[PDB]
Scaffold this active site. Structure first.
Site, mmCIF file in Angstrom:
data_model
loop_
_atom_site.group_PDB
_atom_site.id
_atom_site.type_symbol
_atom_site.label_atom_id
_atom_site.label_comp_id
_atom_site.label_asym_id
_atom_site.label_seq_id
_atom_site.Cartn_x
_atom_site.Cartn_y
_atom_site.Cartn_z
ATOM 1 N N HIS A 1 12.163 24.694 37.964
ATOM 2 C CA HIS A 1 13.184 25.396 37.152
ATOM 3 C C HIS A 1 13.185 24.872 35.721
ATOM 4 O O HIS A 1 13.260 25.630 34.747
ATOM 5 C CB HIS A 1 14.584 25.199 37.743
ATOM 6 C CG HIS A 1 14.781 25.877 39.047
ATOM 7 N ND1 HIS A 1 14.300 27.136 39.309
ATOM 8 C CD2 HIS A 1 15.460 25.499 40.154
ATOM 9 C CE1 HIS A 1 14.649 27.502 40.528
ATOM 10 N NE2 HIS A 1 15.348 26.527 41.065
ATOM 11 N N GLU B 1 13.081 21.583 41.500
ATOM 12 C CA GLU B 1 13.987 21.620 40.360
ATOM 13 C C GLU B 1 13.222 21.495 39.067
ATOM 14 O O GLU B 1 13.564 22.140 38.069
ATOM 15 C CB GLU B 1 15.000 20.510 40.468
ATOM 16 C CG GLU B 1 16.006 20.705 41.637
ATOM 17 C CD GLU B 1 16.706 22.021 41.647
ATOM 18 O OE1 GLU B 1 16.863 22.623 40.562
ATOM 19 O OE2 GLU B 1 17.149 22.459 42.730
ATOM 20 N N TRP C 1 12.705 34.356 45.412
ATOM 21 C CA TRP C 1 13.336 35.515 45.994
ATOM 22 C C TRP C 1 14.132 36.323 44.950
ATOM 23 O O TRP C 1 14.599 37.443 45.264
ATOM 24 C CB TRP C 1 14.223 35.107 47.181
ATOM 25 C CG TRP C 1 15.394 34.293 46.782
ATOM 26 C CD1 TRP C 1 16.654 34.750 46.486
ATOM 27 C CD2 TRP C 1 15.437 32.879 46.657
ATOM 28 N NE1 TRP C 1 17.455 33.716 46.147
ATOM 29 C CE2 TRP C 1 16.753 32.543 46.249
ATOM 30 C CE3 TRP C 1 14.500 31.857 46.847
ATOM 31 C CZ2 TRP C 1 17.163 31.229 46.040
ATOM 32 C CZ3 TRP C 1 14.918 30.534 46.645
ATOM 33 C CH2 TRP C 1 16.233 30.237 46.228
HETATM 34 CA CA LIG Z 1 15.058 39.082 46.561
HETATM 35 ZN ZN LIG Z 2 16.166 26.161 42.806
#
Ligand SMILES: [Ca+2]
Ligand SMILES: [Zn+2]
Ligand SMILES: [Ca+2]
Ligand SMILES: [Ca+2]
EC number: 3.4.24.-
Length: 259
Positions: free
Chosen positions: A170, A167, A178
């Protein structure tokens, strides 16, 4: 050039057991200080194909010693709540909604810890973050206590402190490896904006065997041991240099107050 990020952990607890110990909170900080320094020993788990990509993000964290008023603090706030779960709507981030207000986001990394977090669609989640640039009021990361630290209420497989690593990734402007496709989109279509993280279809959970190929990214496969995947704590062990670039841009930009 180590950025040292003062952290405030806002434990928001309903049941006493959720009022997690300092030792549990400390154990998390200790993890962040390994992971964000590439000092985590499990970095050895990086496939050799990627072993030159692993980044030392050059960030350390410490529990704040001064509060926003300059008073001494342990860097941990503990707030009793009658709220039984919090969601990505940020109820945990305001006293008014049964959480605890953010400390100044330009000076502290707010980490809220609560017992239960749900996504908007009611899925149980371990944590969520606010990316840089958002309002200071909700800036920081929220992690469920059972996925926080490496002792106390932390439970496998989320007991190696990596939910916070993920986190905070982020928080430092890194995206899911992905690419966060919506169900209706081609799973190979979205990018995490990081070149050196292989194009990857979907999040990986648990701990895939390497290689775990998707999006024709064979032979090496998904970099599922990247902290920006969704694998179990013991399975993610690295940020890439490409991610470090983003992190540095975050620190040099939206979060330069921390420099
Ligand atoms: Ca992807
Ligand atoms: Zn995440
Ligand atoms: Ca919000
Ligand atoms: Ca990528």
């Amino acid at each position: 050039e180590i950025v040292k990020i003062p952290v405030v952990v806002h434990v928001v607890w309903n049941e006493e057991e959720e009022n997690i110990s300092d030792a549990q909170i400390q154990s998390q900080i200790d993890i962040l200080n390994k992971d964000f320094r590439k000092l985590n020993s499990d970095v050895s788990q990086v496939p050799s194909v990627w072993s030159n990509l692993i980044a030392d993000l050059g960030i350390e964290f410490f529990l704040a010693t001064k509060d926003p008023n300059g008073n001494q603090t342990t860097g941990i706030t503990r707030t009793q709540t009658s709220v039984t779960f919090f969601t990505t709507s940020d109820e945990v981030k305001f006293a008014s909604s049964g959480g605890e207000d953010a400390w100044p986001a330009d000076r502290y990394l707010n980490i809220w810890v609560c017992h239960v977090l749900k996504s908007e669609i009611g899925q149980d989640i371990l944590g969520y973050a606010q990316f840089p640039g958002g309002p200071a009021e909700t800036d920081g990361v929220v992690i469920v206590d059972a996925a926080f630290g490496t002792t106390g209420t932390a439970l496998p497989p989320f007991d190696k402190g990596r939910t916070a690593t993920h986190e905070i990734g982020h928080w430092l402007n890194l995206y899911h490896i992905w690419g966060d496709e919506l169900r209706f989109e081609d799973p190979c279509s979205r990018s995490d904006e990081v070149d050196d993280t292989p194009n990857q279809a979907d999040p990986n959970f648990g701990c895939p065997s390497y290689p775990h190929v998707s999006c024709s990214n064979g032979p090496n496969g998904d970099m599922f041991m990247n902290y920006c995947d969704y694998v179990d704590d013991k399975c993610m062990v690295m940020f890439t240099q490409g991610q470090a670039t983003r992190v540095n841009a975050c620190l040099d930009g939206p979060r330069s107050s921390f420099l």
